[PDB]
Design a protein around this motif. Structure first.
Motif, mmCIF file in Angstrom:
data_model
loop_
_atom_site.group_PDB
_atom_site.id
_atom_site.type_symbol
_atom_site.label_atom_id
_atom_site.label_comp_id
_atom_site.label_asym_id
_atom_site.label_seq_id
_atom_site.Cartn_x
_atom_site.Cartn_y
_atom_site.Cartn_z
ATOM 1 N N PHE A 1 0.820 -1.208 0.000
ATOM 2 C CA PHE A 1 0.000 0.000 0.000
ATOM 3 C C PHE A 1 0.863 1.271 0.000
ATOM 4 O O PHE A 1 1.713 1.437 0.879
ATOM 5 N N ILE A 2 0.657 2.163 -0.973
ATOM 6 C CA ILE A 2 1.403 3.407 -1.178
ATOM 7 C C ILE A 2 0.377 4.499 -1.536
ATOM 8 O O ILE A 2 -0.643 4.181 -2.144
ATOM 9 N N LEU A 3 0.632 5.770 -1.207
ATOM 10 C CA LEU A 3 -0.141 6.936 -1.646
ATOM 11 C C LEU A 3 0.747 7.761 -2.561
ATOM 12 O O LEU A 3 1.919 7.956 -2.241
ATOM 13 N N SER A 4 0.186 8.343 -3.616
ATOM 14 C CA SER A 4 0.928 9.201 -4.518
ATOM 15 C C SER A 4 0.090 10.387 -4.981
ATOM 16 O O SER A 4 -1.135 10.381 -4.870
ATOM 17 N N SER A 5 0.753 11.400 -5.538
ATOM 18 C CA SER A 5 0.143 12.629 -6.039
ATOM 19 C C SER A 5 -0.595 13.434 -4.952
ATOM 20 O O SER A 5 -1.537 14.187 -5.221
ATOM 21 N N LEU A 6 -0.170 13.293 -3.692
ATOM 22 C CA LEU A 6 -0.788 13.983 -2.567
ATOM 23 C C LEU A 6 -0.640 15.489 -2.717
ATOM 24 O O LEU A 6 0.463 16.007 -2.939
ATOM 25 N N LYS A 7 -1.765 16.197 -2.572
ATOM 26 C CA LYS A 7 -1.749 17.648 -2.570
ATOM 27 C C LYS A 7 -1.025 18.156 -1.369
ATOM 28 O O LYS A 7 -1.104 17.578 -0.290
ATOM 29 N N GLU A 8 -0.446 19.329 -1.535
ATOM 30 C CA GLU A 8 0.362 19.908 -0.460
ATOM 31 C C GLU A 8 -0.542 20.260 0.738
ATOM 32 O O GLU A 8 -0.140 20.139 1.896
ATOM 33 N N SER A 9 -1.818 20.560 0.464
ATOM 34 C CA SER A 9 -2.855 20.824 1.464
ATOM 35 C C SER A 9 -3.271 19.563 2.254
ATOM 36 O O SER A 9 -4.008 19.667 3.235
ATOM 37 N N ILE A 10 -2.813 18.377 1.851
ATOM 38 C CA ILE A 10 -3.245 17.074 2.347
ATOM 39 C C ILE A 10 -2.035 16.347 2.925
ATOM 40 O O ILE A 10 -2.122 15.702 3.970
ATOM 41 N N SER A 11 -0.886 16.489 2.278
ATOM 42 C CA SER A 11 0.372 15.941 2.745
ATOM 43 C C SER A 11 0.628 16.438 4.173
ATOM 44 O O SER A 11 0.762 15.658 5.120
ATOM 45 N N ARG A 12 0.565 17.764 4.349
ATOM 46 C CA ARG A 12 0.655 18.396 5.661
ATOM 47 C C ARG A 12 -0.368 17.830 6.631
ATOM 48 O O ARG A 12 -0.053 17.728 7.803
ATOM 49 N N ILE A 13 -1.585 17.522 6.178
ATOM 50 C CA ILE A 13 -2.681 17.085 7.021
ATOM 51 C C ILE A 13 -2.249 15.745 7.625
ATOM 52 O O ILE A 13 -2.260 15.594 8.844
ATOM 53 N N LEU A 14 -1.809 14.798 6.783
ATOM 54 C CA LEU A 14 -1.339 13.492 7.219
ATOM 55 C C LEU A 14 -0.204 13.710 8.217
ATOM 56 O O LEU A 14 -0.240 13.155 9.304
ATOM 57 N N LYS A 15 0.802 14.521 7.895
ATOM 58 C CA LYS A 15 1.921 14.799 8.789
ATOM 59 C C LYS A 15 1.451 15.357 10.132
ATOM 60 O O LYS A 15 1.829 14.833 11.177
ATOM 61 N N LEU A 16 0.613 16.386 10.112
ATOM 62 C CA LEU A 16 0.041 17.037 11.279
ATOM 63 C C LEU A 16 -0.648 16.003 12.166
ATOM 64 O O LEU A 16 -0.310 15.885 13.344
ATOM 65 N N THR A 17 -1.561 15.212 11.613
ATOM 66 C CA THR A 17 -2.288 14.164 12.328
ATOM 67 C C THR A 17 -1.453 12.874 12.474
ATOM 68 O O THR A 17 -1.974 11.799 12.757
ATOM 69 N N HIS A 18 -0.131 12.969 12.317
ATOM 70 C CA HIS A 18 0.865 11.911 12.447
ATOM 71 C C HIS A 18 0.630 10.686 11.576
ATOM 72 O O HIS A 18 1.165 9.632 11.882
ATOM 73 N N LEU A 19 -0.164 10.789 10.528
ATOM 74 C CA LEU A 19 -0.504 9.744 9.589
ATOM 75 C C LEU A 19 0.638 9.499 8.615
ATOM 76 O O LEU A 19 0.901 8.355 8.274
ATOM 77 N N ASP A 20 1.328 10.549 8.169
ATOM 78 C CA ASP A 20 2.379 10.444 7.154
ATOM 79 C C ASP A 20 3.492 9.532 7.660
ATOM 80 O O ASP A 20 3.856 8.568 6.989
ATOM 81 N N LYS A 21 3.927 9.747 8.906
ATOM 82 C CA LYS A 21 4.931 8.928 9.575
ATOM 83 C C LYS A 21 4.591 7.431 9.685
ATOM 84 O O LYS A 21 5.485 6.642 9.998
ATOM 85 N N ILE A 22 3.346 7.023 9.433
ATOM 86 C CA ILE A 22 2.834 5.666 9.596
ATOM 87 C C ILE A 22 2.191 5.150 8.298
ATOM 88 O O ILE A 22 1.573 4.086 8.301
ATOM 89 N N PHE A 23 2.346 5.864 7.184
ATOM 90 C CA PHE A 23 1.841 5.538 5.853
ATOM 91 C C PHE A 23 3.039 5.440 4.892
ATOM 92 O O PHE A 23 4.161 5.176 5.340
ATOM 93 N N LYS A 24 2.833 5.592 3.582
ATOM 94 C CA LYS A 24 3.886 5.739 2.582
ATOM 95 C C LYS A 24 3.433 6.755 1.566
ATOM 96 O O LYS A 24 2.283 6.691 1.133
ATOM 97 N N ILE A 25 4.318 7.691 1.235
ATOM 98 C CA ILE A 25 4.008 8.780 0.339
ATOM 99 C C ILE A 25 5.055 8.837 -0.763
ATOM 100 O O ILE A 25 6.253 8.868 -0.473
ATOM 101 N N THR A 26 4.583 8.968 -1.997
ATOM 102 C CA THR A 26 5.344 9.355 -3.168
ATOM 103 C C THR A 26 4.608 10.433 -3.976
ATOM 104 O O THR A 26 3.586 10.990 -3.564
ATOM 105 N N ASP A 27 5.190 10.803 -5.110
ATOM 106 C CA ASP A 27 4.900 12.030 -5.834
ATOM 107 C C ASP A 27 4.128 11.749 -7.118
ATOM 108 O O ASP A 27 3.218 12.497 -7.476
ATOM 109 N N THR A 28 4.428 10.624 -7.764
ATOM 110 C CA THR A 28 3.737 10.094 -8.936
ATOM 111 C C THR A 28 3.396 8.642 -8.619
ATOM 112 O O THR A 28 4.080 8.002 -7.815
ATOM 113 N N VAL A 29 2.349 8.075 -9.216
ATOM 114 C CA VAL A 29 2.057 6.652 -9.057
ATOM 115 C C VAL A 29 3.194 5.796 -9.637
ATOM 116 O O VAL A 29 3.420 4.662 -9.222
ATOM 117 N N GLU A 30 3.973 6.364 -10.555
ATOM 118 C CA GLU A 30 5.150 5.730 -11.114
ATOM 119 C C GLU A 30 6.268 5.546 -10.083
ATOM 120 O O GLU A 30 6.997 4.558 -10.171
#
Length: 110
Positions: free
Chosen positions: A79-108
């Protein structure tokens, strides 16, 4: 015409669940269904999410995604997330979700 959906695209060995719409109370069972069932179906293990169309996120979102962390692992899927908006990336980080998920920039890059 438009109130939350997924596009879903089996890649080479990665399954690109593109999402459409912002992520709220509709998603709070919609995507949850469209993934717990799709992760059963999916021929491809690498479940990439695309959030290019996700302009907003509610708490609905994050609880509906984190439950899939098990559902993927119920079928031995990634499971990976990609193309996250900057308004949403911060949200995950703020709510400590980013640190416990996976984030990239393109689905590629997932």
């Amino acid at each position: 015409m438009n109130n939350l959906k997924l596009d879903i695209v089996e890649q080479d060995d990665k399954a690109i669940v593109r999402v459409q719409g912002d992520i709220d109370a509709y998603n709070s069972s919609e995507l949850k269904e469209q993934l717990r069932n799709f992760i059963s179906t999916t021929s491809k293990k690498k479940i990439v999410l695309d959030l290019s169309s996700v302009s907003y996120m509610d708490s609905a979102g994050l609880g509906t995604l984190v439950v899939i962390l098990k559902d993927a692992k119920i079928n031995g899927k990634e499971f990976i997330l990609s193309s996250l908006k900057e308004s949403i990336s911060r949200i995950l980080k703020l709510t400590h979700l980013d640190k416990i998920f996976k984030i990239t920039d393109t689905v590629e890059e997932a």
